[PDB]
Design a protein around this ligand. Sequence first.
Ligand SMILES: *[C@@H]1O[C@H](CO)[C@@H](O[C@@H]2O[C@H](CO)[C@@H](O[C@@H]3O[C@H](CO)[C@@H](O)[C@H](O)[C@@H]3O)[C@H](O)[C@H]2NC(C)=O)[C@H](O)[C@H]1NC(C)=O
Ligand SMILES: *[C@@H]1O[C@H](CO)[C@@H](O[C@@H]2O[C@H](CO)[C@@H](O)[C@H](O)[C@H]2NC(C)=O)[C@H](O)[C@H]1NC(C)=O
Ligand SMILES: CCCCCCCCCCCCCCCC(=O)O
Ligand SMILES: CCCCCCCCCCCCCCCC(=O)O
Ligand SMILES: CCCCCCCCCCCCCCCC
Ligand SMILES: *[C@@H]1O[C@H](CO)[C@@H](O)[C@H](O)[C@H]1NC(C)=O
Ligand SMILES: CCCCCCCCCC
Ligand SMILES: CCCCCCCCCC
Ligand SMILES: CCCCCC
Ligand SMILES: CCCCCC
Ligand SMILES: CCCCCC
Ligand SMILES: CCCCCC
Lengths: 88, 330, 68, 67
Amino acid sequence: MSFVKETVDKLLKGYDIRLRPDFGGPPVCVGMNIDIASIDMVSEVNMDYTLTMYFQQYWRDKRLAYSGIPLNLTLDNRVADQLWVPDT
Amino acid sequence: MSFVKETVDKLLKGYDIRLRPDFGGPPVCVGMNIDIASIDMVSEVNMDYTLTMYFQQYWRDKRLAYSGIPLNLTLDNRVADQLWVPDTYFLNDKKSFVHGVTVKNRMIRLHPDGTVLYGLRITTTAACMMDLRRYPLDEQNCTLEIESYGYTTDDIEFYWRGGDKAVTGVERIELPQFSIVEHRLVSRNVVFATGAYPRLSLSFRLKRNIGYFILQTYMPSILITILSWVSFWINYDASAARVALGITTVLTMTTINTHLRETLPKIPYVKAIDMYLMGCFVFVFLALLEYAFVNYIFFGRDVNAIDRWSRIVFPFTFSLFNLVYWLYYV
Amino acid sequence: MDEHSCPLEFSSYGYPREEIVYQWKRSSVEVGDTRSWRLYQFSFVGLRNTTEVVKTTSGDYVVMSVYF
Amino acid sequence: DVTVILNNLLEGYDNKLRPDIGVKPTLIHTDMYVNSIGPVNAINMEYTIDIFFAQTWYDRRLKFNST
Ligand SMILES: *[C@@H]1O[C@H](CO)[C@@H](O[C@@H]2O[C@H](CO)[C@@H](O[C@@H]3O[C@H](CO)[C@@H](O)[C@H](O)[C@@H]3O)[C@H](O)[C@H]2NC(C)=O)[C@H](O)[C@H]1NC(C)=O
Ligand SMILES: *[C@@H]1O[C@H](CO)[C@@H](O[C@@H]2O[C@H](CO)[C@@H](O)[C@H](O)[C@H]2NC(C)=O)[C@H](O)[C@H]1NC(C)=O
Ligand SMILES: CCCCCCCCCCCCCCCC(=O)O
Ligand SMILES: CCCCCCCCCCCCCCCC(=O)O
Ligand SMILES: CCCCCCCCCCCCCCCC
Ligand SMILES: *[C@@H]1O[C@H](CO)[C@@H](O)[C@H](O)[C@H]1NC(C)=O
Ligand SMILES: CCCCCCCCCC
Ligand SMILES: CCCCCCCCCC
Ligand SMILES: CCCCCC
Ligand SMILES: CCCCCC
Ligand SMILES: CCCCCC
Ligand SMILES: CCCCCC
């Protein structure tokens, strides 16, 4: 039960938030999905439109690899502050 | 200087924000005062009113007691971060804020007996329903309800400090359409199955001022309705004149109606002014229908009977309608 | 002459159906004195309760909704 | 007493992980109390609603025995 705990602990330890995945390697390809929840308004006078969406980004990072845990780890959202993410 | 510094230093340490005063003891009694600075705007459309006020609580805390310092201490407002305060909040609030310029408009004051006075400058958009069934001849019953989110009466109690003098500054308020008639204070406890929660209520009664409507809504309608009756004295053969007068009076009432609703609050709610305008519309409509009857019966088929009776019935019936309207709505 | 059934629906954002499941405790939901409500265009006819599973790219999520 | 118990429960307890991370789904019981269904702004196709939303669940990690 605590196996996941210390697994995630070692995953976060020694993690460099500064550097992208494969800093010295080839560029990292970031896949993207959008789920348009709604288009709230389209303003001719302002020449803009509001848009609500679920914006999802996929990317492979070798630092965040784990074994012995045959389940996808959904973590608390605050962890996003501790990992590298694209500057989209 | 240094003695005051070490006094406050020892006061701060050993103090736990996570625990209330006398946690194992009786409930802490919190006196509450208000000084209203400005009721910025009262909206019928949203059924709410914005209110800027100096809210003040007042409570005894043994932990914050100090001696040897007869002068009262007005510490920096940031010190309020490190001191426990009630969980007070307003139930009928939709949005509120505390003014931040130049510094956060907040104040904490300690007293030698260990009492705390905690003041804030709150601009809150409180909610009150408005029975607009009698608009504009209506009086509203708007309230600010103040309660503790988590604590029951067994853990904290609220009362009005100063009694009826708890709330001041009402005379300084001059709303642009309403006139404050009375304000009332109610301290009570709302009882549920689990326990009773304290509550305070500040209820203003607001009377609406109608001189705007009397001069740009009612008087034009009455005068167009009379100008419609002018048709009954025009000679019956003057079809062009009488029809033009009647139809243009109907158009003028339609114009008054359509351009009035542009200015009144955007609420699809039926109101007294709507009844008055509909009645005047029906009266001008009947005035034109009267000439329809007259032209068919005599010209189409010694004033005639229909005009003779209309000249008395229409003013008399409109006076009766006005009497019933003003008696029912006032 | 229109009637509407406006929903209010909620669910987990990151946790799929196999991680967090929601349930109505008892009696669905409670309403106070409807005379105190700020409805003037419309009148409240009655509410109801619903629970379902919605499929998305992330996974299947338990969606709990209340229709007014 | 209250302070020591308050500080004791925070030992360990990675909040990163939900209760029963690898065992079963976490069952959450929800209650809603509608204070008021505010005005229905048909222009923007929306409506305001004030609610008291109370959710409850079970976390064995927070168990503590005391009076
Ligand atoms: C964790 O996430 C991975 C990736 O989302 C999950 O693996 C994927 O599982 C689904 C079925 O649940 C597989 O879908 C099927 O794949 C076949 C082969 O292409 C296709 O014919 C079917 O129509 C369907 O799409 C999917 O291929 C598989 N892999 C990927 C990369 O999507 C995994 O199950 C999740 N959970 C666990 C416990 O690992
Ligand atoms: C410090 O504050 C206390 C309480 O606010 C003051 O105590 C009151 O002072 C006024 C006038 O000085 C008296 O009329 C009251 O009887 C006092 N007691 C209460 C309960 O109001 C105190 O005077 C202040 N210190 C000063 C002005 O030096
Ligand atoms: C709801 C009001 C409907 C009004 C319909 C327009 C009728 C106006 C003209 C009526 C002319 C008089 C016809 C009856 C004459 C008679 O009784 O001898
Ligand atoms: C709107 C109410 C006021 C008008 C009251 C109208 C009463 C009319 C009475 C006279 C009816 C007979 C008219 C036909 C006379 C004829 O034979 O030429
Ligand atoms: C209800 C607020 C008081 C409004 C007072 C309005 C006074 C209007 C005076 C009208 C005078 C009309 C003279 C017409 C003949 C020249
Ligand atoms: C609300 O949910 C409960 C639990 O699923 C169910 O027993 C109840 O019948 C539902 N409400 C209605 C309107 O039936
Ligand atoms: C809908 C308001 C109707 C008011 C009365 C109409 C005038 C009747 C005059 C006999
Ligand atoms: C708003 C109530 C108006 C009632 C009108 C009754 C008709 C009076 C004229 C006959
Ligand atoms: C409204 C006018 C009625 C006349 C009936 C003879
Ligand atoms: C014949 C004249 C009647 C006047 C009613 C006001
Ligand atoms: C105040 C209403 C007056 C109407 C006179 C016919
Ligand atoms: C002419 C009568 C008017 C009555 C207003 C109450």
